[PDB]
Amino acid sequence: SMKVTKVGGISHKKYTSEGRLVKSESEENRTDERLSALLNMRLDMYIKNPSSTETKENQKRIGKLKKFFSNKMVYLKDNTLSLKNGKKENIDREYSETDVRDKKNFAVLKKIYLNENVNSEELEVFRNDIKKKLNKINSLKYSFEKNKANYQKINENNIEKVEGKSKRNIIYDYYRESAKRDAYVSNVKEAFDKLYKEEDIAKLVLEIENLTKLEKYKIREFYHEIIGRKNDKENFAKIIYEEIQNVNNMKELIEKVPDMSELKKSQVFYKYYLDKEELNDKNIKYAFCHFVEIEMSQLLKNYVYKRSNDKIKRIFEYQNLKKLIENKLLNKLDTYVRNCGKYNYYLQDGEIATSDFIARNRQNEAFLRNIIGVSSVAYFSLRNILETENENDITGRMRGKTVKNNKGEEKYVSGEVDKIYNENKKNEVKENLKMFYSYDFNMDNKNEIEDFFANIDEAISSIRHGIVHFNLELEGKDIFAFKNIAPSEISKKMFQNEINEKKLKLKIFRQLNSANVFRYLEKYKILNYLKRTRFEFVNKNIPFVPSFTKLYSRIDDLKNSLGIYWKTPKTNDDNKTKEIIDAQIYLLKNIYYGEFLNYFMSNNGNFFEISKEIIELNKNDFEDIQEKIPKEYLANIQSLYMINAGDTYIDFIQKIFLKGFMTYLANNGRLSLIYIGSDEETNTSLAEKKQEFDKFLKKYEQNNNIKIPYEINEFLREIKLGNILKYTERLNMFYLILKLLNHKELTNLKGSLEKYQSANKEEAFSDQLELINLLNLDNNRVTEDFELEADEIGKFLDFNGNKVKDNKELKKFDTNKIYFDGENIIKHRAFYNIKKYGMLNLLEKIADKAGYKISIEELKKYSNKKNEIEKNHKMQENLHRKYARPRKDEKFTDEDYESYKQAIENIEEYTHLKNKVEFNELNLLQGLLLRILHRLVGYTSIWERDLRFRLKGEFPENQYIEEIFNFENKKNVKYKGGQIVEKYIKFYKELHQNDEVKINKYSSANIKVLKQEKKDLYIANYIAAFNYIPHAEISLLEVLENLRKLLSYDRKLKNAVMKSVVDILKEYGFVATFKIGADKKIGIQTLESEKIVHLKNLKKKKLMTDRNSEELCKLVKIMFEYKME
RNA sequence: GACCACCCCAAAAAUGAAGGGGACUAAAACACAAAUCUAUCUGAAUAAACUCUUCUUC
RNA sequence: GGAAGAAGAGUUUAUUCAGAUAGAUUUGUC
């Protein structure tokens, strides 16, 4: 296989004139340039040792011969065989003597090995190998030329259609219409029947079925016989070409040669005549045999030739294969009319759909869907915050609605923000709101509150409405516009409150204190630091910068290596020493990421000058002297290092930074810090400081208004953070959502914007990313005190074979006191999160019917094993030292390994138990569900787009067709009311009232069946509206069953559903096996934990532990099959 | 009957449709393969600091 | 509105192992 793109940054892009290979993002045509490159013969190609069979000594001999010839090639620049070298070669190698390849070529190959002679005439051996390459490269350059933009828009002065000009597409248009679909299918079947006959096919399948390595030539050899290659080539090929010259028409050609094989005459029509003559029903038939052939060859190419073991019978049996190729050419045809719709929207009348235009749609749409997770997981929390009792969606109704009724002219409707009071839930919602947002809500002063919830709602919607329903003109950058929301007082103040200069500084102050910086540094020395260095709440990855902790770890050893100019902290007390070291690591950690990186990556750079010191010492103890910039350089260093193998790359890069950082410290006057611990005199002064500072901090966080003491302010005043976020309205509303977000949806949201920024050189989202990095700091952590109730906890407990409803029984259950201390419940982070996002009633049900509960026997194991995890962790810690960084003589005795194995195994058990006990396993499940759900909406998104695609493609004329997808029903003449589904059915029913025989399946009797079962279209409503919650009328397995039915129009989509589900489980740590029946109803056969590979590079057996407990895997299984009742 | 895709282009001589391409289209946006590095968050452990709760004993 | 001993939870910080997302480079593609 020749890889002609993605090497050299070349890509094939399509342009109106022609299709060309392009480089970078320039439009210059580099086809000839790149191909001319590949017309070389790589000399190893000549020798190989694939199998187990060879003796090692011989096998080593040949492996050797491989690497040597891998850097020499043969080309013909101008009728002369010639040689080239890829790379430098060792000046001296003892070649010695060392029937290895096909015989003819040997003479020159040995001489080449020993350097002996040009023997240019003797390079003619390889002439025939090249003219074959040259013919491949040639046929290719044409396969590139003919792949070109072929979709065009005609205004028509009236009509405004889009159509394709590919020869392929000229045949789609003919059958573009629904009416012609049945003829298009027969023509296919004619063609399949002409080429392929049951006896011969029945016998191919035997051969494919009976496959022996490289007996595949048997199948190829057989296929050519079926296709009569020998007849066409031997008999008709030359006559056809020359005669092709003699006549203009296909018709005129046929008269000249009337005994032309059917396939060889379809192939002819396609290349020469299809493009340019009127198509008649007689003419079009010619095109089909070529189309069906390609589909089989494509099947053979994909299945027999390259790659599952006996499924092949499924697609290759005569009766199946026939249907397969029919559906296929239908699927290909249906996606062409959809493409006509799509381009009809985006193209001015002149235009053609070039690769530049096409490419940006996929990228834009795809990004936008990632943001589907954000709105969905945020809605669900907004549902949690106010304990609504709507089976139905609550989007868009936080506020009371007063209407003119059919009678009496005025009436007022429930405001979900207005049930808060009607239902006497003010207390529960107050505490619920506080958990997400830190503000002292007044649940009187209702207007303030109603105006606030209406912020979270409208915020989430501004997103949801854009992504869930295809929006033609939505662009990536604007998803977080939050266009019509105007923040309310409660939101304005809180965002001002949280992103406050003082509060932010008090967070760096708190860090500094807990690092023991305030108890081991004099006030004046600190102020010198603060006037000098800035703080960032999170670091960024400059590309090549090694981790500080890795760097710090290696300080003592290197100074022996290089004149470090440092002294480690040492002291009488070990306990102080660790404390002091943290202070040193925290202060230093701060300069590196920040002040130094700026200087070191800086043009006014230490880095080039230092870098040679590392180089020079290494020579004393060969890396490049090419100037440029540090990231490219170091990159270049990577390449040299890799190519040799013989680790040493990390040291150079580690060594550059350590000496770079120190000399930086000494040079720019931070050096005093070595003596941070040092003097007992001063420390006694500072002994009460860390304690006293901590006492305040709680005081200030609890109050947030406390007068600040003078001693603290001196410090607060000289801290510098770098730029504070400007207040933005958009930022404030973005802030409201971020807090609603779950912990994984934040991490995924963040990686999504960073992808957008990396992908296109736009820093847009720069502000929004800053906020996340601030909030992501403690979003999961338990910010404030919260309360859970035993009856809520109880739901997952087996007390004497019953759930616990009572604070009093909770005592009987908890002999060991993990849940209850006897007056208040224990408040683990895990509990904290379950309250926020727990959908405990549903969770309660699923667990209940999966036999998941927590038992006393399990509690008594957790406490027993809790007593010994310190050891097992200390064990793992030290042992990993031995593996990773080992002493001069140390070995991993197998006993070391068994000891390790046992430790990690004891830890997984404790962890697995601990997670169940603490309700983390339930939190994991909660999120897995919301992800599966919200991922599914994304599918509804395509379908809702594909529909209006094929519509405008099918019926450009119909003005009304767009009405179906516009939710602004004032604006619609027809299909005035409803949802996309309902408007389409009305459209569909009218579309064929007149029918050969009654078309309509959407009868009122039938539609009623559909709506209840969530079958056909109606599944899209179940999915997009999140109706699965909270009842689970239908199963996830069922949903998947008819979501796929719903996407059966596009193959690629229909069989991507289960990939997105298998892959979403792997993220969460489950490996799933499903079975899909002849009935096509999904079931789960197994669910099991993904594994962790420990000690990845030991000659010993793979050691691993499961990611999730079998009890949990058993609970994800039932979740999927969980139906109501 | 998916996980185990899909669409486009190559047929005289170059019947090797035994070939190539695709952020172009799905996989919720940058070919896979392999190996490093890093940012962020999360789980499990330990140490120091502060805060709150529970228990036992005179 | 009494002392003195056990405990636990939360938060901050340094460190060890692991995962998930995302970013950077290298190597190579019968």
Side-chain angles (χ1 to χ4, degrees), chain A residues 782 786 817-820 825-834 862 866 914 917-918:
Chain A
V782 176
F786 68 98
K817 210 181 236 146
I818 102 124
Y819 289 122
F820 199 62
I825 78 182
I826 299 201
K827 321 219 123 103
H828 311 294
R829 217 209 316 285
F831 285 11
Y832 172 68
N833 284 315
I834 226 189
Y862 174 61
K866 193 156 174 126
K914 180 198 201 237
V917 174
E918 285 194 4

Side-chain angles (χ1 to χ4, degrees), chain A residues 290 328 457 501 662 809 816:
Chain A
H290 185 251
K328 215 112 192 166
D457 190 46
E501 181 140 1
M662 295 301 213
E809 304 152 7
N816 47 352

Side-chain angles (χ1 to χ4, degrees), chain A residues 860-874:
Chain A
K860 282 191 222 159
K861 212 172 284 146
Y862 174 61
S863 274
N864 292 340
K865 288 174 185 163
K866 193 156 174 126
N867 288 347
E868 298 175 277
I869 37 186
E870 215 187 306
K871 325 193 158 258
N872 289 319
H873 268 271
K874 277 184 267 128

Side-chain angles (χ1 to χ4, degrees), chain A residues 571-575 577-611 613-615 617 619-620 624 626 628-635 638-639 641-646 648-669 671-674 676-678 681-699:
Chain A
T571 78
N572 62 288
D573 184 36
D574 261 36
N575 196 154
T577 299
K578 223 182 224 314
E579 266 153 84
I580 289 174
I581 299 205
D582 296 12
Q584 187 185 276
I585 303 184
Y586 183 101
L587 293 177
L588 287 177
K589 222 157 110 262
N590 200 105
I591 321 176
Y592 176 71
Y593 277 116
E595 265 211 2
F596 162 65
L597 281 201
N598 301 10
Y599 170 45
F600 211 55
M601 308 320 156
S602 178
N603 168 21
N604 326 332
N606 181 319
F607 177 108
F608 283 126
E609 301 216 343
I610 186 167
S611 64
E613 291 213 31
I614 293 66
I615 293 167
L617 211 95
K619 289 187 195 173
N620 297 330
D624 228 328
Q626 301 255 308
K628 27 163 171 167
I629 263 175
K631 113 221 296 179
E632 311 92 356
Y633 182 114
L634 277 180
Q638 203 164 248
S639 36
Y641 264 81
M642 175 84 279
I643 292 168
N644 308 5
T648 54
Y649 180 53
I650 309 188
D651 270 15
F652 186 62
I653 190 96
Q654 283 194 312
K655 281 185 309 170
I656 298 209
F657 280 95
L658 212 177
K659 307 170 196 163
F661 184 45
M662 295 301 213
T663 90
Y664 173 91
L665 278 187
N667 189 136
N668 235 300
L671 233 155
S672 75
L673 300 152
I674 326 192
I676 285 191
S678 82
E681 274 204 52
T682 21
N683 298 17
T684 13
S685 178
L686 285 346
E688 234 31 42
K689 303 292 202 49
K690 173 194 210 206
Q691 295 85 157
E692 283 169 2
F693 284 155
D694 252 1
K695 291 180 174 161
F696 165 91
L697 278 162
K698 197 68 168 132
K699 272 177 245 144

Side-chain angles (χ1 to χ4, degrees), chain A residues 368-391 393-396 398-400 402-403 408 411-418:
Chain A
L368 276 174
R369 267 128 187 170
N370 288 247
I371 280 69
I372 293 184
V374 187
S375 69
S376 306
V377 174
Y379 162 64
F380 280 133
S381 310
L382 161 63
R383 286 192 71 126
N384 258 54
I385 285 177
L386 27 108
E387 321 180 349
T388 189
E389 26 197 75
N390 287 242
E391 295 302 320
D393 184 1
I394 73 136
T395 327
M398 300 284 288
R399 265 203 241 245
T402 152
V403 52
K411 89 196 314 177
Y412 175 103
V413 319
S414 71
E416 271 274 329
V417 83
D418 206 342

Side-chain angles (χ1 to χ4, degrees), chain A residues 105 123 170 210 224 275 317 385 399 441 499 556 671 804 897 986 994 1122:
Chain A
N105 329 281
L123 279 176
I170 303 199
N210 333 321
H224 295 195
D275 187 356
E317 187 219 73
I385 285 177
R399 265 203 241 245
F441 295 92
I499 169 22
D556 289 345
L671 233 155
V804 339
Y897 178 106
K986 178 180 152 133
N994 301 310
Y1122 171 83

